[PDB]
Design a protein around this nucleic acid. Structure first.
Ligand SMILES: Nc1nc2c(ncn2[C@@H]2O[C@H](COP(=O)(O)CP(=O)(O)OP(=O)(O)O)[C@@H](O)[C@H]2O)c(=O)[nH]1
Ligand SMILES: [Mg+2]
Ligand SMILES: [Zn+2]
Ligand SMILES: [Zn+2]
Ligand SMILES: [Zn+2]
Lengths: 107, 177, 97, 112, 270, 171, 551, 84
RNA sequence: AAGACCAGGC
DNA sequence: AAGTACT
DNA sequence: AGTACTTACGCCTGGTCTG
């Protein structure tokens, strides 16, 4: 994880996806001043083990594509650093039934 | 129609329908690897005459029976004995079956489900393909030539000598009349 | 009288499957066409009499179906074909799911 | 969080008139407009581009244009869509048709 | 549009909300699996009210001359005062009604207590009342166990989803949660005996009803909820016949279009 | 050559017969629209085996009328000749252009010119025949033919066969 | 539907395979040579020439013949014809792609313009979505205008690997009318891309190239977006209109084909006669035109192909375009039978779930009942009664699929019914029906009611069930639909009946109430102030039909 | 794919759509001279006989419940509880 | 009979 | 007319 | 930054002119 101030050089950024497995991410100061996850609206998410996932499907008899998705750039997706394929469990409050469990796969 | 155990995924261009011949290339519906209802694989079913005569008889009979479980609430001698089994358990408009029973029972070569049993226990040691292990059972044959010629699909799959012993043991078992 | 989009949308709402089909078919269009089990088109030359059926081109005589569909639809298709687009009608699912 | 907003906003459009609508509905809608990925609009430029078979998107704003590019890239249609069946004159998988009905010959005996 | 946009959506046999592809949209219609039709505004008493009143109403302490059930209510009243093995059930019950509180106050910040929910309990009892001509004079005949141990066994049979595993039998507890709070709220020992003098009969009945009246409020796998939802909105959007912001029909248009340049952009910061 | 292929069929039953003994009627109708049928892909459906254990499965009720539809999975003895198959039968008809031998339920015909040479055709015979140095072929005589080509048609299958090869002729 | 029985098994459509027509199939399928442009008059003699419409396609004049297919008019659908073009033409709607494809592949050797070799390309080949590959691909190589021969592999940019050959520069392209043009770059080189050319480059494109691009080896090869053989919709798609005999009545379509045909022959007769080389491509545009307009007419390239009198011309597309047309106005919604409409009025004497059907209509509308021992009697009575008295019927139908018109038929009063026969009878007291008021935007804009045959001419519905339909009696009309299958009704009475609609889910509360008089009045009658004396109390009691007779 | 009578997971109760369609379907047949498995207390309206067969749970039908992925579960009018 | 408009009803 | 999307 | 692209409530009853 690297933290740039005003910005990085477009000549630079194109050097992150050049040493796999290893992964890197880029964050601007101004976007980390406030934790977006603390906002009244944004409910809490959770990463699912490649085990917990292969289960979520088998229990709902779902194909990967029939699952509700989240953006690879989606703010919270970055706060946890998802990877194309990683599923998230979204647990929020409900005026119909206290808690509702939901899932968001990534794309 | 009467559908047939495998759904050959026809993708628009139906064209290749090979030749039917004693090259053992029979319609797709008769490869040697077909599928049983239970969902299993099973060798083709090759019936040599007078073996068919028995299988057709077998059912036509066990039919007459279960056809009364619900009603409570020597050559020429077989011609009559069968016509009856029919005028009882047949469509009576199955002129085909009638004619199949005559032929099947006139040209037959075995009367004992025991004799026909050996016929089978014998040829089934060849590794030969079912259509042969049928033409062999219902076709008279004295020489390997009368054979390997009226059944070209044999030509190299068996030495003349062996195919000849089998032929010897055929006319030996060949029930009389 | 009219049984349009909106009035349909309600029957779907009600979840009144059959009644919907009924207004849409048996009480309006309804038509019996023939198909090729091979090339899903109306090609088939049905002589409902001598049972002859054919379909030269995809050439058949054996694999042939009969389906009931809203004439308007037949026409939808024919019109499409005339625009060189092919609407295949198949009576079995091979794609699973 | 967005969903939560989209909903919240929409809810305010129905309450400002003193009318009441049970969550579930605006909820569902808000959801449909959001699962996919971000904000999918209820318009010819959105939900009418999704993986839904042709015939269904056919019945809305682009018709022919949509049909054309269907035989072009040889699309396949499930006929699981409401519209689909309606166009064919078939009983659609909807309420009364979310299943099949059969004659169990067995139980058709103990009944006599 | 609204309609064409949701036709295909309906509740499938697994109790999920999907469209024509198979894409889940809601994993439980309405985040609760209840058919809107079977629902009424009830009140979650547990929420509103000073921390004081709460105690005087839901608290029971069998180890105290002034916080125990006066034997004038329970048949086995005098022989309870002190019993320590009961005070644990009794205390479990309370440390729960307590959790319920905070939980609710974490969901409905407003403090609003009236919400739509299945099974009208208020009335379900009202009937029990005059159905057994319960006299407010003589005492009940409920073991404290009878109560607290049936209320629990009740929640157990309020099934929405039925799965045979964990991931499922877990969504279960969820889709119910909100209900039970109301439930535990209205079937609290003190209440059950001091407010509505139910006998064992009354109670065992009140219980049967709730379970079945609930299993009725579930949603039928078949409902073409998509269309429904659409109409439910567009409909009242026609009756709209028209403090200084874009509001109403032109607005709803804006929203659905996912328009970038809204006439009014505002934004409230606290 | 005769076969025992595993088939299946679809029968649409009117509610009328939704009786106590339905199974019975089905089977029976199976046998009406099968035994004696003919296709190029199956040949001759001659006889349904194991009448008893016929699998009916659960049939579904259509959706406009009450007729139900069961996929009857059975098994039977079929027989469909081929080009290059050697079979012998009984002659039936015999004319100037040849004689027709009857192999089973089918009828194979032999062209005069598809026979040998030394064999001529005697018209002034009664019954009609074909004479040779030593061989005599007529009505009831048994021959062994080699099927050169097949032709499917309506509810039957004919075919031409030769007796111009070796080990072919009368028996 | 249709009548006549067919030994053809019957199924439901399960999948729909969208393909493109291969000139080859187009031919195969057809049964019409279609060489002449004329209609009929074999020298005025009436019939049809083996030229256009009927060189064996469908027919007219109420005459069996449909290629012996007999059956006649109703139950012959049309039988496509074809008509070999003179020179390949574009497909008005595909042009958009035919272009984009070329900008995607270069001519001469016809093959991709970016292989596994280039990495941005890789990411563009994993995408499993025609709309998405072909859209990412395009964007990625629409800019490169040189057929690279050699490119720097996964190793050193120093080392150069070799692939396909022919660096013949790639020309950018633009759309001008119905033709494609491109320059080749000192100074450009502008030439017209002949259809005859494009076709080729496509024909040669690779199998894995098709697919890599959003296509399909069996159902839609690019080489097909270019027309060579044109299918010819049969009469029923473009039927006529006769004013008895010696006149005309031809359909718009049957003309643009007539056109296309003309414009096709004129061409041909030039490539085999005095062919002034480039005085031909002036009449090849005409074809490209017609064979384009025939399908579309609302293009930006102006000319509407106005047909004599300046009437627009109905392009096939136009027939399907949203609303009023096929898809939306014919299939998704239809005019229907067993339906009535009139004015509605209040009638405080009907149960909620009823609805007053005027005798006039009850006698018009019918229900197909099937003769059964349970009814036989009742039924024969209705049949005896005739189609004029009320409780009666107006059509008997036996197994032999024949209609006995009760109002005529010398056997009117005769007839013995037969179990199995059906008896179209009149709607009767308590036949469930679907009632409704447009605009329909509620489950409830349509509910089922109990039919109550009444005099006078107006659907009489109960008051409280007013607000759901949202109706006033100020002259508002309503529609009534009548079920038909014993199972059809079932669906109405079990899910659509008004009593079930009482508690609306659109707002988890009841949706019908008590209004006007009943409301206003119900208050007055309540007040402590309000007292009622015996003489009346008694009548009032009497009115509540379920009064237990206990003053 | 099918599913064992055990491991069953659907709703033990009959859905309105089901019951609705069963009665209809059943009527249709009864109305077609299909055999009636109950004593007609004098009834003569199919959908009414159907209502009867359905209360003595003597309707020989089976409701196949397809799932989103294709597999189904089979319940009998017998089993299925009828609250409504 | 088809298709364009105009008036109009709720 | 506008709003959006594509060039 | 300019230009183009597909849309636009539901149903229903009148009378009128023309290629
Ligand atoms: N589809 C349509 N529904 C309409 C139309 N006019 C009215 N309605 C319906 O009838 C409705 C009620 O208000 P109105 O517009 O009738 C006015 P009015 O003053 O006559 O109302 P009342 O006070 O109820 O007599 C109106 O809300 C719409 O729900 C219309 O042009 N189209
Ligand atoms: Mg009005
Ligand atoms: Zn075909
Ligand atoms: Zn024809
Ligand atoms: Zn090149």
């Amino acid at each position: 994880i690297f933290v740039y101030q005003n910005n990085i050089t477009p000549s630079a950024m194109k050097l992150v996806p050049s040493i796999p497995p290893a992964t890197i991410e880029t964050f601007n100061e101004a976007a980390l001043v406030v934790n977006i996850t603390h906002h009244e609206l944004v409910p809490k998410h959770i990463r699912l083990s490649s085990d917990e996932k292969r289960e979520l499907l088998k229990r709902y008899r779902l194909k990967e594509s029939q699952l509700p998705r989240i953006q690879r750039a989606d703010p919270v997706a970055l706060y946890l650093g998802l990877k194309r394929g990683e599923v998230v469990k979204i647990i929020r409050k409900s005026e119909t039934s206290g808690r509702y469990a939901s899932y968001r796969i990534c794309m | 129609s009467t559908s047939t155990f495998q759904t050959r995924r026809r993708r628009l261009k139906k064209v290749e329908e090979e030749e039917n011949a004693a090259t053992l290339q029979l319609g797709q519906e008769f490869q040697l690897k077909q599928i049983n209802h239970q969902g299993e694989e099973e060798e083709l079913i090759a019936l040599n005459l007078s073996e068919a005569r028995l299988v057709i008889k077998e059912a036509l009979v066990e039919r007459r029976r279960a056809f009364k479980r619900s009603q409570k609430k020597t050559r020429e001698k077989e011609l009559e004995s069968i016509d009856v089994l029919l005028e009882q358990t047949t469509g009576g408009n199955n002129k085909d079956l009638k004619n199949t029973m005559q032929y099947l029972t006139n040209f037959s070569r075995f009367r004992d489900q025991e004799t026909v049993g050996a016929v089978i226990q014998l040829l089934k040691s060849t590794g030969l393909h079912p259509f042969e292990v049928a033409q062999l059972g219902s076709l008279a044959c004295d020489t390997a030539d009368e054979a390997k010629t009226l059944i070209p699909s044999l030509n190299n799959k068996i030495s003349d000598d062996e195919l000849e012993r089998i032929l010897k043991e055929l006319s030996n078992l060949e029930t009389l009349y | 009288l009219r049984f349009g989009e909106m009035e349909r949308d309600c029957m779907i709402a009600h979840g009144a499957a059959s009644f919907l089909k009924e207004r849409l078919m048996e009480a309006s269009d309804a038509f019996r066409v023939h198909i090729c089990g091979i090339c899903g088109l109306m090609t088939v030359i049905a002589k409902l009499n001598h049972n002859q059926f054919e379909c030269k081109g995809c050439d058949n005589k054996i694999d042939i179906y009969q389906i009931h569909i809203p004439y308007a639809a037949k026409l939808l298709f024919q019109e499409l074909m005339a625009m060189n687009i092919t609407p295949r009608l198949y009576t079995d699912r091979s794609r699973d799911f | 969080a967005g969903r939560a907003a989209l909903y919240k906003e929409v809810y305010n459009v129905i309450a400002s008139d003193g009318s009441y609508v049970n969550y579930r509905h605006m909820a569902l809608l808000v959801d449909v407009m959001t699962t996919q990925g971000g904000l999918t609009s209820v318009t010819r430029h959105g939900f009418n581009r999704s993986n839904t078979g042709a015939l269904m998107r056919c019945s809305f704003e682009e018709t022919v244009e949509i049909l054309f590019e269907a035989g072009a890239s040889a699309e396949l249609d499930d006929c699981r869509g409401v519209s689909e069946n309606v166009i064919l004159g078939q009983m659609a998988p909807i309420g009364t048709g979310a299943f099949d009905v059969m004659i169990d010959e067995e139980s058709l005996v103990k009944y006599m | 549009r609204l309609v064409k946009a949701l036709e295909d959506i309906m509740v499938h046999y697994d109790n999920t909300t999907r469209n024509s592809l198979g894409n889940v949209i809601q994993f439980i219609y309405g985040e609760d699996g209840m058919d809107a039709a079977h629902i009424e505004k009830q009140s979650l008493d547990t929420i509103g009210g000073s921390d004081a009143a709460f105690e005087k109403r839901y608290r029971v302490d069998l180890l105290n001359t002034d916080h125990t059930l006066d034997p004038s209510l329970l048949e086995s009243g005098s022989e309870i005062l002190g019993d320590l093995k009961l005070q644990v059930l009794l205390d479990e019950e309370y440390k729960q009604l307590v959790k319920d509180r905070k939980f609710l106050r974490e969901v409905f910040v407003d403090g609003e207590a009236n919400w739509p929910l299945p099974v009208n309990i208020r009335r379900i009892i009202q009937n029990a009342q005059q159905t057994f001509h319960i006299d407010h004079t003589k005492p009940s005949d409920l073991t404290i166990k009878d109560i607290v141990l049936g209320v629990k066994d009740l929640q157990e049979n309020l099934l929405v989803l039925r799965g045979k595993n964990e991931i499922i039998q877990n969504a279960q507890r969820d889709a119910v949660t909100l209900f039970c709070c109301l439930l535990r709220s209205r079937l609290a020992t003190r209440r059950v005996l001091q407010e509505y003098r139910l006998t064992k009969q009354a109670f065992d009945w009140v219980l049967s009803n709730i379970e079945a009246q609930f299993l009725r409020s579930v949603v039928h796998p078949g409902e073409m909820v998509g269309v429904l939802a659409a109409q439910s909105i567009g409909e009242p959007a026609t009756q709209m016949t028209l403090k200084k912001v874009t509001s109403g029909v032109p607005r709803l248009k804006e929203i659905l279009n996912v328009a970038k340049n809204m006439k009014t952009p505002s934004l409230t910061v606290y | 050559m005769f076969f025992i292929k595993d088939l299946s069929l679809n029968i649409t039953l009117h509610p009328s017969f939704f009786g106590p003994r339905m199974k019975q009627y089905l089977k029976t109708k199976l046998l009406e629209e099968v035994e004696g049928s003919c296709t190029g892909k199956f040949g001759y459906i001659l006889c349904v085996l194991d009448y008893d254990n016929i699998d009916i499965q659960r049939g579904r009720i259509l959706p406009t009328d009450g007729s139900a539809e069961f996929n009857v999975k059975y098994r039977a003895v079929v027989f469909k000749p081929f080009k290059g198959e050697v079979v012998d039968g009984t002659v039936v008809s015999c004319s100037q252009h040849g004689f027709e031998v009857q192999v089973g339920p089918m009828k194979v015909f032999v062209t005069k010119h598809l026979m040998p040479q030394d064999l001529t055709f005697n018209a002034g015979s009664n019954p009609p025949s074909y004479q040779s140095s030593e061989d005599v072929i007529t009505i009831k005589s048994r021959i062994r033919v080699k099927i050169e080509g097949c032709i499917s048609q309506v509810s039957s299958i004919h075919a031409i066969g030769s007796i111009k090869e070796d080990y072919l002729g009368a028996i | 539907v249709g009548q006549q029985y067919s030994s053809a098994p019957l199924r439901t459509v399960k999948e729909v395979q969208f393909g493109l027509f291969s000139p080859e199939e187009v031919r195969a399928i057809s049964v019409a040579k279609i060489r002449f442009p004329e209609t009929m008059d074999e020298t005025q003699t009436r019939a049809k020439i083996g030229g256009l419409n009927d060189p064996r396609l469908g027919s007219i004049d109420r005459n069996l013949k449909c290629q012996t297919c007999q059956e006649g008019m109703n139950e012959c659908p049309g039988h496509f014809g074809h008509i070999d073009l003179a020179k390949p033409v574009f497909h008005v709607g595909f042009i958009a792609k035919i272009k984009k494809v070329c900008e995607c592949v270069c001519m001469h050797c016809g093959k991709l313009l970016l292989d596994e070799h280039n990495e941005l390309m890789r990411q563009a080949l994993a995408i499993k979505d025609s709309k998405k590959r072909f859209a990412a691909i395009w964007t990625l190589c629409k800019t490169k205008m040189v057929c690279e021969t050699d490119v720097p592999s996964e190793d050193d940019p120093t080392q150069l690997v070799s692939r396909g050959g022919c660096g013949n520069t790639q020309p950018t392209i633009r759309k001008d009318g119905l033709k494609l043009v491109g320059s080749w770059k000192d100074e450009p080189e502008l030439r017209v891309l002949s259809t005859e050319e494009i076709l080729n480059i496509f024909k040669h494109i690779s199998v894995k190239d098709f697919t890599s691009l959003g296509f399909n080896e069996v159902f839609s090869r690019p080489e097909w977006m270019i027309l060579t053989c044109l299918p010819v919709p049969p009469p029923p798609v473009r039927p006529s209109i006769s004013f008895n005999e010696s006149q005309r009545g031809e359909d718009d379509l049957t003309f643009k084909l007539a056109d296309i045909l003309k414009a096709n022959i004129s061409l041909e007769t030039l490539e085999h006669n005095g062919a002034p080389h480039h005085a031909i491509e002036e009449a090849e545009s005409l074809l490209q035109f017609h064979v384009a307009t025939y399908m579309d007419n609302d293009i930006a390239g102006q000319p509407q192909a106005l047909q004599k009198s300046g009437r627009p011309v109905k392009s096939i597309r136009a027939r399907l375009k949203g609303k009023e047309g096929r898809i939306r106005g014919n299939l998704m919604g239809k005019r229907v039978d067993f339906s009535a409409r009139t004015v509605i009025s209040g009638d405080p004497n009907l149960e909620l779930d009823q609805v007053g059907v005027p005798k006039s209509i009850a006698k018009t509308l019918t229900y197909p009942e099937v003769v059964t021992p349970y009814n036989i009697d009742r039924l024969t009575q209705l049949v005896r009664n005739g189609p004029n008295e009320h409780p009666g019927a107006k059509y008997v139908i036996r197994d032999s699929g024949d209609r006995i018109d009760l109002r005529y038929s010398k056997r009117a009063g005769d007839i013995q019914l037969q179990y199995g026969w059906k008896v179209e009878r009149h709607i009767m007291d308590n036949d469930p029906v679907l009632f409704n008021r447009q605009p329909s935007l509620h489950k409830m804009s349509m509910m089922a009611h109990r039919v109550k045959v009444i005099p006078y001419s107006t659907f009489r519905l109960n008051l409280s069930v007013t607000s759901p339909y949202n109706a006033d009696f100020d002259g508002d009309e309503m529609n009534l639909h009548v079920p038909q299958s014993e199972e059809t009704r079932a669906e109405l009475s079990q899910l659509c009946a008004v009593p079930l609609q009482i508690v609306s889910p659109q707002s988890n509360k009841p949706c019908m109430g008590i209004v006007q008089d009943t409301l206003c009045g119900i208050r007055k009658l309540t007040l402590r102030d309000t007292f009622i004396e015996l003489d009346q109390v008694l009548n009032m009691l009497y009115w509540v039909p379920d009064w237990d007779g206990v003053i | 794919k099918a599913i064992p009578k055990d491991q069953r997971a659907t709703t033990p109760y009959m859905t309105k759509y089901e019951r609705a369609r069963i009665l209809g379907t059943r009527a249709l047949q009864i109305s077609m001279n299909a055999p009636v498995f109950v004593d007609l207390e004098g009834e003569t309206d199919p959908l009414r006989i159907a209502m009867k067969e359905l209360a003595e749970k003597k309707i020989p039908l089976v409701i196949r419940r397809y799932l989103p992925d294709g597999s189904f579960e089979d319940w009998s009018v017998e089993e299925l509880i009828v609250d409504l």
